[PDB]
């Protein structure tokens, strides 16, 4: 029952992730930082191409 114990919170955290994923897309012309959660940014000299 450890799968029924541990992955139950992993189900609801994935279920809550589907709630915030609806929030981010918003308007077409929405934001330059709210779109900076899914698509990534990094430190200096990461993107080679």
């Amino acid at each position: 029952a450890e799968f029924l114990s541990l992955s139950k919170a992993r189900i609801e955290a994935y279920e809550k992730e589907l709630e915030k994923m609806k929030n981010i897309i918003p308007f077409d012309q929405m934001t330059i930082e709210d779109l900076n959660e899914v698509f990534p940014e990094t430190k200096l000299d990461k993107k080679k191409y």
Partner: protein, 56 residues
Amino acid sequence: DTSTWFITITSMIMTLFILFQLKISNYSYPASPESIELKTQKHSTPWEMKWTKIYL
């Protein structure tokens, strides 16, 4: 014309390369957007592997 004496413009050119490194530094690359979709796929697949190991 053949102008002279040069104490002018060249000190007013390097102030300009504080401007152009300010504007062009805030640009966006289309390619970086295709990279963030890759790491989201492998993370939940390993999380499902963490759930498969939670089964096995």
